[PDB]
Design a protein around this nucleic acid. Structure first.
Ligand SMILES: [Zn+2]
Ligand SMILES: [Zn+2]
Ligand SMILES: [Zn+2]
Ligand SMILES: [Zn+2]
Lengths: 386, 396, 396, 385
DNA sequence: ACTTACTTCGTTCAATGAATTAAGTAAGT
DNA sequence: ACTTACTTAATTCATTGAACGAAGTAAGT
């Protein structure tokens, strides 16, 4: 990523994208609020807003109440300038959503398919629905495709390095969709990252710039947001906190290591510990509340493991806030008090800074909205790099 | 941390700082090569270079070999445009260095003084030493002061929130030094971040853009660099991997928690475990629990010191394996006075840490040791000032 | 010296100073009358008036009676936005005044002190007095210091080149005072120019734009105003009509020349001619040669005093006739100490001076006396600051 | 009244200022304009475009390269228009058609006894003005400038009185305006017109301050301070020639007794002569030949002129005095005496010397000066209304 | 002759900030 | 229903200063 040369195009783009983003955030806003918050004289907004309206990305809104005074006319973000299609690839099915530029779902469908070991066919099935959801619309307005998957992703290339869930290896997902949509960006990322984009744009991100998102289900996912940016490692390759070692020589994990955190702090623990003594999360939780000794032990220890996992996310990253999301299970059923009891005693609370641990305020559609946000985030990012 | 308004001042800064940096990294370069690398027409570069030469930060170099073609004149970075003073605060001494703008040490000195619970005294002594390090030079050429410290730092306010090692609490370091030097920037950061900065500019960073820096010795420090940027959490507050819990209900750490990685993967382990092992190995020759002493007794064959040293290596290995799984840093660079005894732990670290999530998927993470000497801690502190002064000021 | 560049800062100043002066001139006026007079739309005036009110130099006044008609609100000049200190330097005393922005005297005092050949002592005493004159007020509201002096002045540099009456030679008055008050303008001008400013702002200037001001007393001073501007010659150096030669090879004057008008048309003449007459009138009751004493004995019927007074009135008349023929001032205002005994010379002045070039062509030049009192010299000095502060800054 | 502050005022200030620098130099590079007027080259892009669009400047020749694309000189169009100047004398009416530099293109003299025939004189002016433009487009005529001997009301353009011509209350401008309603017409005294010539073509090329003193049949004085001529109330000029130097002295034509010009001008010869040929040239020559009466007249006129000039220096502080002969050769005056007397003054006594010298200009300057009445108005920065 | 390197002169365009138009409210007769 | 007096919203245009383009010189192979 090299910084763009300093010139007039860079000046125009910076001011138009910044003003545009404030308008997105508010939905509607007066020229005067934009001026105060972005430090622009009204005459500069004359040219910026004129260009944006000419593109069709903003619209004239309603007249505001008079305070003197000529009545101001609201500047409205055109959420329908275009649309996005998002896809979520699951074991049993392919979920789809056509969304507006606010990531609000307009249409959604589900196509059942056995995606395990047949990526070629899954891609073609994706390409088909993408074309079908735009069947009663103009495909010029299709601004991109966003894909959420469970696995390891090379974001530099848009390839799925590995997906244990689906039995995929080195699938050039983006390359294959690009043959069907050459002018349309196609982005793939892991589920936890798509969900985190949903929190950033629709959830916790509306009041915080820093938080960590922890998904607990069949595995444990972690995505850290610092200053409204998600942390990725080298070459854009995401870190894998779920596969940190907590017990040397412990349960054999599907990643090839022994003793991974997610083998103790996720639903996998029930499967593992179960065999050593039904183990689906919801049944185990019910049985626990009913006082079954085995079910209470599993829920209790998973809660302890999760607690130490979350404490270490806090100590390692200094996220300020941790959001727990259930992935295929209801997080309110977790031993939340234990998790909080353990993780709230950390390095930073010891020094006078509390870190709040809470649960998501978003619903299931957020996974798909997040996948769409992969595209929207890219479209509205101030283009200072090349 | 917000983007500046798009205007002529912004683009003027983007271009002149980008050109300046290109000249600075190459030491010497021609106008044609700058123009080609930066996509400028010659007239554009002409004006940018005039401003820089008039400031005195670049100088005319010698001519180069012909390629056609008139002989192009090199443009040279004036490494002596100004100078920097760096400081490293330790329990029993204060270290000082005066560097050029490439962070090369021109002078350095150290003094005995106990800063333990004596912040006003230490700070007054540091101010006098900054003045003395300038010697006969022009004070107007002092570009800043950079300070490496062991503790918890608020980089925004320049305050040391806490340093358990020094017994300091809520010390307005930057502000107190601004009372003596009002017209110059003064920055403070953790020791590990200073060293990483030195690594970024003078070591591993010259050839790679991603790496984790792990200091082993009297403690355990971690800093991660991704795409030439050091990771910091919320509000610019550093992460604290050394204070991750590896053993619930384990050794009490100076941070208030129990079972921190630092209590098992550093010198602290020898004192914690040593107390427990004394009666189990009565014949042992270990008189002291400092790193160098434990290394000598283990390398001599003492059963207790080999257990202590080998166990510390194991815990360190698992710590590094978890650095890899968590951050995906591409490479891990081990650092610190603990390397003086690398022969005793590097093999165990490599055995444990080479098996990780990423190696399971076909990506090997190199684990190596630093190629920088001990002065890098001081150079790193100097680079706090240099990094900040040469950074393209895109943010306001 | 030259006109400012045409840009937004210039037009901003032209408009806000023009509106400010309109308000200041009228004391209180409405937005509508300003807009009417200055040809502005109401929105334009709204912004100009916001700036002025925010600075605190105009205030919101009371409502005006309806014209049919929402009630228009008066805009008032804040005469107390700041204050000014003025000084008058005499041989035997230093006079001080503190004035509001209408040049109205709030306070004034005087002190005995011999400034003769003692500029440094006098200037130190003036500086301590400026400080004391401020009293309980905020020094930040002292807009300046204006000084009236008898002598030759370089107004650019603020230096007294020469003052024969004080024995001062190349005294950097303004620079020496700037040592005490660096952020405050300090102006110096001759007594006659100070009084003329007072006349321009508080007296004759309220009704007319052209007049010559002539001071009679212990000297003769002239200042000419045409189109509300005081005439100055080359480099801003004042003209010196009092030092015109009326009698070749005549009385030696303090300026180095012989026969100057001032040696015949002022008190100086009583001393020069008095010396030559003593023996021709031994019986005469006239002891002293000061103005009032000569007037007393002449009004009592003394042959010597009547001759001295009659002649000086005659020479004064010819001096004024030539002021008229030379400048075409439209009006001549007589001023000074000497007015106390106007009954003895005003008739002769009128007889001689009313017959002039312009009266011969049908244009009569009115010759009158000032309607201002003694404090006008101090007010004039204060007006050096006020004039300069409220002047539309079109030059630089 | 100052003009309101707005964009038109901004435009005019910068265009007129840049235009004036170009007139001063004849030709100049855009870079010198930029450095002299503190403008960025891009601001000049628009200023020079507007001025070229008007046809008041032209593209000049290229300049020697210094690196370096060659700069193209920006040239003042002295022929954008022309001016007609008139000088009203006792025996004749002189005329000149000049370019915008006041350089004489065409000139003529129309013999006429203007004494007591004002309407007629004005009709000859209007006709010759109309004829001077016989071979040139009339809309290029930018104004008419008239130099006259006498008293002038400049607010109205009327000749209040001219003793030379026996005119009284003649509405010169009003009468010419009937023939040239779109053309400005300016009237002023000869001395003021000559001073404009000095200011643009002579002493004004090296000085911002000077007094011009004409010595002929009468004594004229015009004072320039900071490149502006001093006028009295309502623009009515002062009359230093009619200051009293001798109470009950020679009866002057202004109605006063003892005026300076009755002693320090050629009138002194006529006056003193009768009390004992008195034309200046004959008296000067007779004096050089040792005639006792002629030497006395020349000696005393010199002393009187000397005291007159000393008092101009003392009154006005002009920095320098320029002596001009009007109908006579100034070099024939007792210049050393004038200098001896006048150089001892108030200001030289205080360390500031005042140079007294003679004009470097020739006779056509009177007419060039009258044309400059119009030119000075056209090129003045319109900051007022 | 060709190439490469550097310079200086002069233009374009986005932002800026002053007046100014656009379109109301505010409060009387 | 008028009339006059204020307010706030949003636009125009001359200047500005950054890159950029025009059109040369400079000094080699
Ligand atoms: Zn695993
Ligand atoms: Zn700890
Ligand atoms: Zn004198
Ligand atoms: Zn006369």
């Amino acid at each position: 990523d090299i910084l763009r040369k300093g010139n007039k195009d860079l000046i125009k783009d910076i001011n138009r994208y910044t003003v545009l983003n404030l308008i997105r955030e508010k939905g509607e806003i007066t020229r005067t609020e934009i001026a105060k918050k972005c430090d622009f004289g009204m005459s500069t907004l004359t040219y910026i807003l004129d260009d944006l309206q000419q593109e069709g990305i903003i619209l004239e809104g309603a007249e505001t109440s008079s305070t003197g005074g000529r009545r101001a006319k609201l500047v409205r973000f055109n959420k329908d300038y275009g649309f996005v299609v998002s896809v979520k690839v699951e074991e049993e099915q392919l979920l789809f959503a056509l969304t507006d530029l606010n990531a609000e779902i307009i249409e959604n469908t589900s196509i059942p398919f056995s995606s395990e070991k047949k990526p070629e066919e899954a891609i073609e099935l994706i390409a088909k629905n993408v074309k079908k959801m735009c069947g009663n619309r103009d495909m010029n307005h299709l601004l991109g495709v966003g894909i959420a998957i469970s696995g390891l992703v090379n974001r530099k290339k848009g390839t799925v390095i590995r997906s244990t869930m689906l039995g995929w290896e080195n699938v050039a997902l983006e390359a294959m969709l690009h043959a069907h949509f050459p002018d349309i960006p196609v982005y793939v990322d892991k589920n936890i990252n798509c969900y985190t984009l949903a929190e950033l744009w629709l959830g916790e991100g509306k009041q915080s710039n820093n938080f960590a998102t922890v998904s607990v289900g069949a595995g444990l996912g972690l995505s850290v947001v610092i200053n409204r940016q998600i942390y990725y490692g080298a070459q854009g390759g995401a870190g894998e906190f779920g596969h940190t070692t907590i017990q040397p020589g412990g349960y054999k994990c599907h990643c090839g290591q022994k003793g991974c955190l997610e083998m103790y702090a996720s639903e996998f623990y029930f499967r593992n510990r179960g065999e050593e003594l039904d183990f689906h999360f919801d049944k185990v939780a019910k049985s626990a509340r009913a006082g079954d000794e085995m079910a209470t032990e599993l829920m209790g220890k998973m809660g302890e493991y999760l607690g130490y996992g979350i404490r270490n996310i806090i100590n390692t990253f200094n996220p300020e806030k941790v959001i727990i999301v259930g992935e295929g299970l209801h997080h309110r059923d977790l031993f939340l008090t234990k998790i909080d009891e353990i993780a709230s005693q950390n390095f930073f609370s010891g020094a006078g800074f509390e870190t709040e641990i809470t649960t998501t305020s978003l619903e299931d559609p957020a996974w798909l909205q997040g996948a769409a946000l992969l595209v929207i985030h890219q479209l509205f990012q101030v283009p200072i790099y090349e």
